[PDB]
Write an enzyme that holds these catalytic residues in place. Structure first.
Site, PDB file in Angstrom:
ATOM      1  N   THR A  37       9.789  13.226 -30.107  1.00  0.00           N
ATOM      2  CA  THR A  37       8.336  13.130 -30.068  1.00  0.00           C
ATOM      3  C   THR A  37       7.846  12.046 -31.019  1.00  0.00           C
ATOM      4  OG1 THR A  37       7.969  15.375 -29.316  1.00  0.00           O
ATOM      5  CG2 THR A  37       6.251  14.353 -30.656  1.00  0.00           C
ATOM      6  N   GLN A 114      11.048  16.527 -20.711  1.00  0.00           N
ATOM      7  CA  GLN A 114      11.244  17.776 -21.436  1.00  0.00           C
ATOM      8  C   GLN A 114       9.933  18.535 -21.440  1.00  0.00           C
ATOM      9  OE1 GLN A 114      11.880  18.519 -25.760  1.00  0.00           O
ATOM     10  NE2 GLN A 114      13.973  19.161 -25.275  1.00  0.00           N
ATOM     11  N   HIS A 191      12.489  23.005 -22.571  1.00  0.00           N
ATOM     12  CA  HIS A 191      12.590  23.117 -24.020  1.00  0.00           C
ATOM     13  C   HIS A 191      12.534  24.582 -24.385  1.00  0.00           C
ATOM     14  CE1 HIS A 191      12.775  22.125 -28.057  1.00  0.00           C
ATOM     15  NE2 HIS A 191      11.847  21.190 -28.147  1.00  0.00           N
ATOM     16  N   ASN A 194      14.366  24.840 -31.001  1.00  0.00           N
ATOM     17  CA  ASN A 194      13.537  24.359 -32.113  1.00  0.00           C
ATOM     18  C   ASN A 194      12.363  25.272 -32.473  1.00  0.00           C
ATOM     19  OD1 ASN A 194      15.172  22.218 -32.090  1.00  0.00           O
ATOM     20  ND2 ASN A 194      13.725  20.815 -31.077  1.00  0.00           N
ATOM     21  N   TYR A 196       9.933  26.524 -30.733  1.00  0.00           N
ATOM     22  CA  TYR A 196       8.638  26.443 -30.078  1.00  0.00           C
ATOM     23  C   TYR A 196       8.510  27.683 -29.191  1.00  0.00           C
ATOM     24  CZ  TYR A 196       8.725  21.757 -32.152  1.00  0.00           C
ATOM     25  OH  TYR A 196       8.800  20.689 -33.034  1.00  0.00           O
ATOM     26  N   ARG A 243      17.407  23.433 -23.076  1.00  0.00           N
ATOM     27  CA  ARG A 243      17.801  23.120 -24.450  1.00  0.00           C
ATOM     28  C   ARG A 243      17.707  24.336 -25.358  1.00  0.00           C
ATOM     29  NH1 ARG A 243      16.155  18.593 -28.961  1.00  0.00           N
ATOM     30  NH2 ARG A 243      18.127  17.431 -28.786  1.00  0.00           N
ATOM     31  N   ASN A 251      10.834  25.577 -37.725  1.00  0.00           N
ATOM     32  CA  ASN A 251       9.686  26.371 -37.253  1.00  0.00           C
ATOM     33  C   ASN A 251       9.906  27.875 -37.450  1.00  0.00           C
ATOM     34  OD1 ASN A 251       7.764  24.329 -36.360  1.00  0.00           O
ATOM     35  ND2 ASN A 251       9.161  23.924 -34.654  1.00  0.00           N
ATOM     36  N   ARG A 348      17.853  10.476 -34.045  1.00  0.00           N
ATOM     37  CA  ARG A 348      17.140   9.557 -34.931  1.00  0.00           C
ATOM     38  C   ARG A 348      17.648   8.127 -34.794  1.00  0.00           C
ATOM     39  NH1 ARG A 348      17.540  13.682 -39.908  1.00  0.00           N
ATOM     40  NH2 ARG A 348      19.075  14.529 -38.437  1.00  0.00           N
ATOM     41  N   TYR A 375       6.090   9.465 -36.696  1.00  0.00           N
ATOM     42  CA  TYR A 375       4.878  10.080 -36.159  1.00  0.00           C
ATOM     43  C   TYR A 375       3.682   9.199 -36.516  1.00  0.00           C
ATOM     44  CZ  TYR A 375       7.447  14.375 -35.328  1.00  0.00           C
ATOM     45  OH  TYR A 375       8.340  15.307 -34.841  1.00  0.00           O
TER      46      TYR A 375
HETATM   47  C1  LIG Z   1      10.958  12.401 -35.024  1.00  0.00           C
HETATM   48  C2  LIG Z   1      11.665  13.440 -34.209  1.00  0.00           C
HETATM   49  C3  LIG Z   1      11.061  14.006 -33.093  1.00  0.00           C
HETATM   50  C4  LIG Z   1      11.742  14.967 -32.351  1.00  0.00           C
HETATM   51  N1  LIG Z   1      11.144  15.530 -31.244  1.00  0.00           N
HETATM   52  C5  LIG Z   1      11.814  16.483 -30.507  1.00  0.00           C
HETATM   53  C6  LIG Z   1      11.216  17.051 -29.388  1.00  0.00           C
HETATM   54  O1  LIG Z   1      10.085  16.706 -29.052  1.00  0.00           O
HETATM   55  N2  LIG Z   1      11.891  18.004 -28.653  1.00  0.00           N
HETATM   56  C7  LIG Z   1      13.159  18.389 -29.033  1.00  0.00           C
HETATM   57  O2  LIG Z   1      13.765  19.238 -28.380  1.00  0.00           O
HETATM   58  N3  LIG Z   1      13.754  17.826 -30.143  1.00  0.00           N
HETATM   59  C8  LIG Z   1      13.091  16.876 -30.886  1.00  0.00           C
HETATM   60  N4  LIG Z   1      13.698  16.315 -31.990  1.00  0.00           N
HETATM   61  C9  LIG Z   1      15.084  16.745 -32.386  1.00  0.00           C
HETATM   62  C10 LIG Z   1      16.113  15.809 -31.748  1.00  0.00           C
HETATM   63  O3  LIG Z   1      16.128  15.991 -30.349  1.00  0.00           O
HETATM   64  C11 LIG Z   1      17.514  16.037 -32.307  1.00  0.00           C
HETATM   65  O4  LIG Z   1      17.934  17.352 -32.017  1.00  0.00           O
HETATM   66  C12 LIG Z   1      17.528  15.808 -33.814  1.00  0.00           C
HETATM   67  O5  LIG Z   1      16.893  14.583 -34.107  1.00  0.00           O
HETATM   68  C13 LIG Z   1      18.943  15.779 -34.382  1.00  0.00           C
HETATM   69  O6  LIG Z   1      19.675  14.734 -33.783  1.00  0.00           O
HETATM   70  P1  LIG Z   1      20.181  13.491 -34.673  1.00  0.00           P
HETATM   71  O7  LIG Z   1      21.011  13.997 -35.828  1.00  0.00           O
HETATM   72  O8  LIG Z   1      21.001  12.546 -33.829  1.00  0.00           O
HETATM   73  O9  LIG Z   1      18.964  12.781 -35.217  1.00  0.00           O
HETATM   74  C14 LIG Z   1      13.022  15.362 -32.728  1.00  0.00           C
HETATM   75  C15 LIG Z   1      13.617  14.796 -33.849  1.00  0.00           C
HETATM   76  C16 LIG Z   1      12.941  13.833 -34.583  1.00  0.00           C
HETATM   77  C17 LIG Z   1      13.583  13.221 -35.790  1.00  0.00           C
END
Ligand SMILES: Cc1cc2nc3c(=O)[nH]c(=O)nc-3n(C[C@H](O)[C@H](O)[C@H](O)COP(=O)(O)O)c2cc1C
Length: 394
Positions: A37, A114, A191, A194, A196, A243, A251, A348, A375
């Protein structure tokens, strides 16, 4: 400048670069972009950014064959609560979305929406401003003491949604799925991770219910399976992902701290496998690893060691996307991809490296990423992240 303490490694010789059919899409490599996001949506309307959004996604589709999952997207207005987060229920939104899927597709890649329902992680005051409820599983239990004041200082106390209002969300899920398929998306991801709204019904901490939607492993999972059943019998199982975040605590979820948290997720993976053997196998299942139990903690931290996602594989027999802290650890990915239905999610570090798929095949360094433009209503930290050719040329 790259992550200075990152000793990369080539993965081009690994199953991470052997093709794989997921749903209807012939993936050419198994690096998958998870939902991230980015908060560039426009207010009012929750409209995807008409300046930058197509460039962003296009850029990241550049490697042909990339499974891309779009940002969390609201199935309706009651579903969201964040001003700058894209929806997919209005003709406004769907017009721009189709522009995004076309940009992804032009790059020979794929795109999956998603479907994101916020639950208690919404801003109660943003929802009270638009005359919406503040939904969770229970009404006693709050996400944290700040949300609780926001809600209470906006006469918008947390609302345990009734069996009807659940039906309405299911409805809104299916429509938002359908919009997404007609508008062009290759599939949708429910989704349910996380913390939600769906996760809040799964987790026994957030779910104090006394009805068929709480009290038991089956009940808690009833809602998440219910959305899966609707969206599947609507657009088709080969277009529908899911997911889960079993060990996460973001959260305010129990994660590993709950003893029976693994039976809870095993149950849902068991019920997705029962449906699979009955003809209706999902396209994939997308797991958050315990490596990252809060995405807003830097890497290595909040990483629950006392639990592994391996239990999924003994249950659910279809593809498995795994996301978490995999950018900085090619040695972990090289092992995890030996299993021939594993795909790796890069979160990321796909924000900072639009050519992240090259840098992984070629062992090249990764762009350091800017936490402060995650963000932000700006093009910086969004599309001005150089490819490797461009970064040297700086
Ligand atoms: C800025 C940001 C926004 C994210 N938005 C979502 C999201 O909208 N929906 C979701 O399921 N995960 C979201 N995530 C989690 C990522 O999908 C992922 O699980 C998390 O970044 C860990 O992966 P990584 O270690 O490769 O960064 C977000 C993560 C970050 C950092």
């Amino acid at each position: 400048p790259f992550v200075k303490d990152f000793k990369p490694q080539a993965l081009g010789d690994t199953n991470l670069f052997k093709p794989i059919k997921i749903g209807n899409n012939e993936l050419l490599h198994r690096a998958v972009i998870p939902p991230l996001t980015r908060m560039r949506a426009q207010h009012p309307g929750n409209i995807p950014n008409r300046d930058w959004a197509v460039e962003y996604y296009a850029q990241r589709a550049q490697r042909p064959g990339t499974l891309i999952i779009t940002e969390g997207t609201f199935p309706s207005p009651q579903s969201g609560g964040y001003d700058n987060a894209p929806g997919i229920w209005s003709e406004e939104q769907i017009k721009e979305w189709t522009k995004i899927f076309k940009a992804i597709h032009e790059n020979k890649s794929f795109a999956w929406v998603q479907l994101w329902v916020l639950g208690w992680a919404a801003f109660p005051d943003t929802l009270a401003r638009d005359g919406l409820r503040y939904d969770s599983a229970s009404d006693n239990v709050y996400m944290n003491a700040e949300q609780e004041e926001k809600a209470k200082k906006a006469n918008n106390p947390q609302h345990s949604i009734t069996k009807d209002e659940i039906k309405q969300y299911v409805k809104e899920y299916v429509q938002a799925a359908k919009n997404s398929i007609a508008a062009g998306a290759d599939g949708v991801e429910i989704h349910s991770a996380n913390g939600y709204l769906l996760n809040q019904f799964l987790d026994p901490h957030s779910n104090n219910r006394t009805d068929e939607y709480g009290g038991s492993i089956e009940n808690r999972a009833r809602f998440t399976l219910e959305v899966v059943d609707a969206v599947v019998d609507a657009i088709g199982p080969e277009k529908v992902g899911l997911r889960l975040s079993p060990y996460g605590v973001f959260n305010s979820m129990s994660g590993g701290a709950e003893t029976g948290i693994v039976a809870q997720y095993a149950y849902v993976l068991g019920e997705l496998e029962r449906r699979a053997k009955a003809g209706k196998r999902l396209a994939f299942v997308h797991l958050v690893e315990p490596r990252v139990t809060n995405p807003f903690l830097t890497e290595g931290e909040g990483e629950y060691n006392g639990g592994s996602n391996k239990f999924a594989y003994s249950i659910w027999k279809g593809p498995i996307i795994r996301a978490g802290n995999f950018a900085l650890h090619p040695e972990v990915v090289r092992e995890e991809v030996k299993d021939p239905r594993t795909l790796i999610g890069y979160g990321r570090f796909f924000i900072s490296n639009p050519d992240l798929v090259d840098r992984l095949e070629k062992g090249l360094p990764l762009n350091k990423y800017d936490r402060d433009t995650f963000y932000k209503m700006s093009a910086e930290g969004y599309i001005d992240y150089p490819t490797y050719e461009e970064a040297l040329k700086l």
